[PDB]
């Protein structure tokens, strides 16, 4: 054997071409894996064709893979058929690609940044089968680190600076110990609502929790929990999505543009 | 500003988690777990416990022997002067056998120690690979990590063992030293005509660059949707939440296409793995089937031509 | 002696000891092969 | 830490990044440390000849006495200004060769005359002068001897590398490239000149030795590798600069200086002018250049002294 | 066409500039003001590169070989002024278009982030890559005093630029910031392979097993290296490693020539000349 | 005259730690800088008429 | 009645913003003078460039 | 000073003792290293006595 395959072809040239064929197959494989969610696409192409043309692009979809959930929570198929969901919005113009304007109060529309899918109405579970996100009042073995302030008792302040409530309890993740939610006693109504840690900016000196997402008045409409001591995956999405809607809807100037 | 979720503001303490129970007959995990406040600021506070089984013990014993041999020879290279050892530490190295020894075992200070350090380090790395395989197996997990580690080991073996054997010379192998192995890296490229023109070196860089690009993309993406629980990617894979949807929708709006919460980790896995796969191939092709990479590029029309504004009379053409 | 197995696990001790002995045995053979005076695979 | 901008000299095509970068203040200090000596006023025409007057003149025979005296005054400033004529002469006796410095300096005259007359491929009408190396010191500041490297245990064979050395510009490369390449004539080229393997069995280690020599060359001239190379193809002369051709002759010129002028003088030289291996203080790059692309930044001193050229 | 769950997210507003003028989608892409600006910045820059390839360095050397196409910066003699189009001026125009396209891409990402109500980590992270490019073609050339110090626009020609810039310091591996940046690049790749492996091995376990848990994830790397950073923190670490690699790479090149002109190994002489040894 | 009020703002244990650490580092740094010079290296300047092999001129 | 800037910009941000901008601008201008050899005061009041003679050139030949 | 003892109400002697001992040891090591690196004051390599 030798390095020269022909007068021009050599082993290194063959090796690099061999990689291109493998890499092409790898990209096709990866794109097919990418398409296990959200495909076939929601398209006008399908709509005018009466559903006779499924928009998948290239490569086409893969055969459904099986996710067996722990604790007999069920089995999900990664490529799955999903029922169409109506949107609480209307197009701002009739051309394709035009955005939609939410209907009613945008913070309550469940559209745009306030939209969320309906997840399972079951709590995420620890390896031992207990609910994962729970208040500190039921996860008695958990505690706040000594060097960090206790969130409980802190004043919750909305985006406008007005006081929204106080922190009654802290919800922790029992698998990876960390704060995920802050239970707020709303100043107006008194009904407890959850506040995700991702929307909470701590002011350690002032003992204040600043929520730039929504105003103090918006806290009254935060989606509530069925059971007081646990939260389902469905409820988690509903709560987080509501605060996210405030990043665009809470104040009129947040819609933009800047100039 | 809004909470960027870079540092944990308020840390939570629980009893140390012993870990998921191992199959019956396995050795217990060692180390009483402790909590580090500063580790918990950026990540998890718990340090330990660790599983140190039979395979890990052998890897440590083999690994220390290789490391001790390297450090001893570095100290010997400065004639036992520990002060000069510290001054020159970055420049010191255990250097491979001389070219005239071929693949034979040379005397200790002429490459013999290097071969022992190379063998013992290779054994410890191989034993560590078995440990990563066993740890995944003991937890009922798939062997993605051990495959990715094997790809890195393939590159490591190509550098110090497979290429030297194919060239029939231990002198082709990498010195055990900080600046010495950088000198080897530069000299390798110089010796074989500018490794920039090795297409598998080009590919390795594209995947190394892509690894940083993808982890920056994916790391920023998860942090951007961690306000929705995007960090809990198992939940988002089995039960697609708004975090996965917004993550995919962001990238679809940005660049016209997107991954899923699971498939992004397949892109990540392959990008990192291909970095060392193509690196190994490029090394194995160099000096064996290609002598001068730049001249190979000229033959295949890869190297650009520049206008001749400067040139040298060749003294050998006299 | 006999109590050395009361504070040392027999399993961890044996694999560690055999690991050291195997590494030590390899090291001595390697050193002898490195020595021209004791390389038994020469002429 | 240096302050930008540097003075940049482009030597290649735009975008190829073949450039020399000079810190203006570092360049200023180097120039002030490499200033030439002003030439003596030209000697009066005519007069008695060297051969008629002087007995033991074996090299500068074709000189007039006025020019010969001018040369002795010049070399005194160039070599031994703090010691005077008696550094190379027995006191009272001008023609006596009973001191080693006279035997050496006579051979040094031949070294200079041969360089200025037969090595113009390198020194190119600028030539050299005893000042170019000595700079007013009897011992040139930048000389080299065969380096044993750092001390090693008696049972350890030295690697000759993996040790921070200014000789290779503080890298871990083989720290003694002078001996194989500037005294001996070991092959510097390591790069194969075919795309596919065709018998070049040069080891990777030999590339480190060449890299060490080029580190010393670049430090000696105060330039970077692109002064003579397009680094995309180090081997290729077509993509190199004209200075690479000059450096090629300079290497052979240095080998001739060390093998044919310095080495045969070893017995005359005292032990203080010898290295641990017993080899004499030898000439390399930086003996003339001293960190500059041209010695004394191209100052032209030799042209004013006819004694420095072969008859 | 949108993802099957995407329609409920295609909301009006969130633009930085433009309001409703360009607030629409073209296929999958969101356009906005900076989609229009970015697209025609890229389109012009791409067409000028093709035009630069059409005339080449000269008519004799002109090539459409994708490896050999090269749009070169001006000669250093042009300083920081504008060069003629065929003498590096085209490179200067393409560089301006590239900056316009890259920044518009980042700003379009900001508008998308506002629409979706997510953190701005992605555009912030992309700014580091843009900053590295700006250092290479703007900051460093200005510090050196000539636009010709920028790298040429060519798939292989800019490797020749990298090679020669590296050998302008005789051994570029000894650059301390370069060493730090490579360490971050190498560690990031290792962390990415580890994170990709762990997620895949947990969600695609051995046959006959259910999907694993976050407890398995922490246990796995605790069993291997005695520490688990956590599901959230690995993304902090991956972002940190990738951003630190680019930051230190930008530092390493901007100190190579503007703030250091010697060989890089010589820089370590501060440590070698410490009076302790 | 009323400068004692500063430790009402700063813990006077940490300041004592800071000033010692800063002064020590500053003292060592100034000594290193002097040792790095030929003029003020008090150990290798010849005075008081120092009393201490072939040489390697290039290294 | 020029207070209105303080009803639309926080005193604290502007004062820190002004200080950072002014310090950066002053550093920038000081550097620009150091960039110019005519205004480089770090060279000394009685700074004289080295005299070049006998065919000396500070820089090697360019392109 | 006649009232210096009041420092120890602010610094715990445990931390002071460790810091003092660790710093002095490194200082003594550093000074010995500095002397050994000089030809004049390297007492091991100077050739005296004999
Ligand atoms: C080793 C590393 C390097 C290797 C080489 C790398 C080389 C560089 C790579 C560059 C990649 C650039 C392309 C990226 C995507 C382009 C944008 C896009 O449209 O995507 C849609 C495209 C297909 O989308 P789909 O989901 O199948 O579409 C569904 C239907 O088609 C939807 O049906 P539809 O009806 O919408 O179909 C139409 C659709 C069809 O889309 C396409 O055909 C475009 C794709 C062609 C390629 O049209 C579009 O998508 C674009 C619409 C544009 C409208 C405006 C037109 C203006 C022109 C008018 C001017 C008139 C004057 O997605 C991709 O192609 C993804 C490519 C991924 C490449 C990654 C591999 C390279 C990186 C490897 C490193 C990573 C580590 C690996 C381990
Ligand atoms: C001068 C050089 C000579 C040479 C001189 C010697 C000398 C001297 C010795 C050896 C020893 C050995 N030589 Mg020899 N040997 C040479 C060439 C070779 C070559 C070869 C291909 O050239 C090989 C493969 C070997 C191989 C061996 C091994 C069989 C043995 C080391 C085992 C060990 O390290 O256990 C350590 C690793 C372990 C895991 C130990 C535990 C063993 C098991 C797990 C316990 C079982 C208990 C059992 C009931 C009791 C019997 C013990 C048995 C070893 C199994 N030699 C050359 C020709 N060789 C050593 C020996 O004889 O040891 C037995 C020894 O002292
Ligand atoms: C080239 C000829 C001269 C020279 C020509 C000039 C000229 C002309 C000028 C100066 C000016 C200055 N020169 Mg000068 N200067 C020279 C050499 C020097 C040298 C030196 C050792 O070589 C030094 C140290 C200086 C230093 C100075 C400063 C005293 C001054 C810049 C003011 C400033 O930065 O405010 C900016 C920084 C501030 C902090 C401003 C404070 C105001 C704000 C509102 C405070 C907000 C506080 C808030 C907390 C924010 C804090 C900052 C952030 C936290 C980061 N010059 C050479 C020798 N120099 C300027 C001057 O006089 O300014 C008064 C000026 O016009
Ligand atoms: C996808 C390619 C990238 C990659 C992947 C990769 N690396 C990997 C893996 C993977 C997938 C692993 O699974 C494996 C791992 O364990 O990661 C955490 C590993 C690993 N990659 C590592 C390093 C590494 N990877 C690198 C690169 C890369 N790794 C690529 C960029 C590099 C570079 C860039 O140079 C390095 C340096 C290790 C951290 C680890 C493999 C560890 C290993 O093999 O250990 C062997 C052990 C020794 C040599 C030392 C043992 C001796 C001790 C020092 C003795 C003294 C102390 C003792 C332990 C005290 C305790 C004793 C007890 C008895 C009490
Ligand atoms: C900072 C950490 C890493 C990183 C991060 C990062 N990159 C990013 C992002 C992030 C977070 C994005 O959000 C953004 C994106 O959307 O990615 C999909 C992006 C991106 N990073 C990209 C590439 C990229 N990133 C790189 C590097 C990195 N990106 C870092 C390692 C590299 C390297 C190392 O080479 C490349 C090539 C794109 C895929 C994308 C940005 C796309 C964009 O800006 O689109 C607008 C512009 C065009 C469509 C074309 C413009 C053409 C010009 C007008 C002319 C050409 C000019 C150019 C200088 C030519 C040079 C050619 C030669 C060099 C061959
Ligand atoms: C009016 C009119 C016609 C106007 C013109 C049309 C206009 C303006 C369009 C605007 C858009 C513009 C300007 C288009 C022109 C320029 C073009 C064509 C750009 C194409 C887009 C582009 C640059 C693509 C390059 C992509 C490449 C090559 C590399 C990107 C990196 C890479 C390999 C990504 C693959 C992996 C993916 C998909 C990562 C994204 C991703 C990550 C990182 C997650 O973490 C994640 C987590 C959970 C769910 C999903 C995801 C996810 O999808
Ligand atoms: C190692 C230091 C931590 C440590 O030592 O923790 C050990 C855990 O086990 C162990 O080996 C664990 C061994 C691995 C611990 C080190 C892992 C890296 C350190 C944490 C890094 C955090 C940040 C990572 C990068 C983002 C405990 O061992 P013991 O001595 O039994 O207990 C001593 C303590 O109880 C204190 O009295
Ligand atoms: C605690 O430790 C103490 C203090 C006791 C000693 C410590 C010393 C220290 C600090 C050592 C530091 C060492 C350093 C910094 C090392 C750096 C090493 C680097 C950067 C190495 C980089 C690359 C090296 C490579 C890639 C080498 C690969 C070699 C291989 C794969 C060789 C394999 C060789 C084999 C398998 C030999 C085969 C031949 C057989 C037949 C055995 O030969 C007889
Ligand atoms: C004609 C002008 C020159 C004269 C008169 C001259 C004179 C001398 C003398 C007298 C010595 C011995 C000094 C001593 O050992 O004390 C000597 C040595 C030496 N010269 Fe020159 N020299 C001249 C030119 C050169 C040049 C051009 C070079 C460089 C190429 C050079 C390099 C050396 C070297 C390396 C030594 C050995 C070191 C030493 O012994 O001092 N000399 N020269
Ligand atoms: C540190 C930067 C430098 C590097 C990395 C470098 C690298 C090399 C290499 C690898 C070779 C061997 C070429 C082959 O195998 O065919 C070589 C030869 C050569 N280099 Fe350099 N070099 C550098 C600096 C210089 C400089 C500054 C000059 C000019 C003063 C120079 C002049 C030469 C010459 C003339 C040869 C050919 C020698 C011969 O064939 O005998 N180099 N260089
Ligand atoms: C380029 C990337 C984006 C950055 C945007 C800014 C681009 C450059 C700013 C424009 C500055 C133009 O400034 C102008 O430059 C040209 C070209 O050097 C100068 O021209 C001057 O130098 C050039 C070459 O150095 C000589 O050929 C010419 O004889 C001389 O007049 C003009 O004297 C100057 O007025
Ligand atoms: Ca003294
Ligand atoms: Ca003594
Ligand atoms: Fe992830
Ligand atoms: Mg070496």
XYZ file of N, CA and C in Angstrom, chain E residues 82-134:
159
model
N -8.773 55.620 4.225
C -9.478 54.750 3.297
C -8.599 54.460 2.088
N -8.584 53.213 1.678
C -7.800 52.755 0.546
C -8.668 52.648 -0.696
N -8.063 52.665 -1.885
C -8.836 52.422 -3.106
C -9.477 51.044 -3.077
N -10.627 50.933 -3.751
C -11.455 49.733 -3.641
C -10.673 48.469 -3.977
N -9.864 48.507 -5.031
C -9.085 47.342 -5.426
C -7.777 47.214 -4.658
N -7.510 48.104 -3.707
C -6.295 48.052 -2.907
C -6.605 47.988 -1.415
N -7.666 47.278 -1.043
C -8.068 47.137 0.340
C -9.290 47.935 0.727
N -9.752 48.848 -0.128
C -10.966 49.585 0.178
C -12.193 48.696 0.227
N -12.241 47.682 -0.640
C -13.340 46.723 -0.597
C -13.361 45.980 0.732
N -12.186 45.620 1.248
C -12.108 44.992 2.561
C -12.671 45.908 3.637
N -12.346 47.200 3.564
C -12.858 48.148 4.546
C -14.375 48.269 4.459
N -14.927 48.256 3.245
C -16.377 48.313 3.098
C -17.023 47.035 3.618
N -16.444 45.876 3.295
C -17.001 44.614 3.772
C -16.948 44.555 5.293
N -15.850 45.034 5.883
C -15.743 45.068 7.339
C -16.861 45.902 7.951
N -17.163 47.051 7.346
C -18.261 47.883 7.827
C -19.584 47.139 7.710
N -19.808 46.476 6.573
C -21.024 45.687 6.399
C -21.089 44.548 7.405
N -19.956 43.891 7.658
C -19.930 42.809 8.633
C -20.291 43.313 10.023
N -19.745 44.463 10.420
C -20.097 45.046 11.711
C -21.578 45.399 11.741
N -22.077 45.993 10.656
C -23.495 46.295 10.578
C -24.363 45.057 10.682
N -23.974 43.986 9.991
C -24.743 42.748 10.050
C -24.664 42.098 11.428
N -23.465 42.028 12.015
C -23.315 41.356 13.305
C -24.084 42.086 14.400
N -23.962 43.412 14.454
C -24.665 44.186 15.471
C -26.171 44.101 15.266
N -26.626 44.217 14.016
C -28.052 44.093 13.733
C -28.575 42.726 14.146
N -27.775 41.680 13.937
C -28.163 40.351 14.386
C -28.333 40.317 15.897
N -27.398 40.925 16.629
C -27.503 40.971 18.082
C -28.723 41.767 18.525
N -28.977 42.906 17.881
C -30.121 43.729 18.250
C -31.438 43.072 17.864
N -31.467 42.345 16.746
C -32.651 41.570 16.403
C -32.908 40.485 17.441
N -31.842 39.893 17.979
C -31.997 38.920 19.054
C -32.579 39.568 20.303
N -32.216 40.825 20.565
C -32.772 41.541 21.711
C -34.277 41.710 21.553
N -34.728 42.079 20.351
C -36.158 42.248 20.115
C -36.904 40.928 20.261
N -36.303 39.832 19.794
C -36.902 38.514 19.983
C -36.983 38.171 21.466
N -35.920 38.464 22.219
C -35.941 38.232 23.660
C -37.064 39.011 24.327
N -37.272 40.260 23.906
C -38.361 41.056 24.459
C -39.719 40.460 24.110
N -39.871 39.956 22.884
C -41.132 39.342 22.485
C -41.445 38.119 23.333
N -40.440 37.290 23.593
C -40.628 36.043 24.314
C -40.551 36.205 25.825
N -40.138 37.366 26.314
C -40.033 37.587 27.745
C -38.983 36.733 28.421
N -37.842 36.535 27.771
C -36.764 35.725 28.310
C -35.601 36.637 28.686
N -34.607 36.055 29.347
C -33.396 36.789 29.636
C -32.631 37.137 28.376
N -31.782 38.157 28.490
C -30.984 38.633 27.368
C -29.604 37.996 27.322
N -29.472 36.775 27.839
C -28.174 36.116 27.897
C -27.619 35.844 26.505
N -28.466 35.405 25.572
C -27.978 35.068 24.234
C -27.397 36.275 23.509
N -28.107 37.401 23.356
C -27.468 38.562 22.717
C -26.255 39.054 23.475
N -26.286 38.984 24.807
C -25.119 39.349 25.597
C -23.941 38.439 25.281
N -24.188 37.129 25.208
C -23.132 36.187 24.853
C -22.632 36.423 23.434
N -23.544 36.702 22.502
C -23.142 36.977 21.129
C -22.289 38.237 21.037
N -22.515 39.208 21.926
C -21.695 40.415 21.937
C -20.226 40.103 22.194
N -19.937 39.047 22.957
C -18.547 38.657 23.172
C -17.888 38.216 21.870
N -18.588 37.415 21.064
C -18.054 37.031 19.761
C -17.892 38.245 18.856
N -18.869 39.155 18.872
C -18.746 40.392 18.108
C -17.575 41.217 18.620
N -17.430 41.309 19.943
C -16.314 42.046 20.506
C -14.972 41.483 20.082
N -14.862 40.155 20.018
C -13.633 39.538 19.532
C -13.362 39.915 18.080
N -14.399 39.903 17.242
C -14.231 40.324 15.856
C -13.867 41.801 15.769
N -14.509 42.634 16.587
C -14.186 44.056 16.602
C -12.749 44.289 17.043
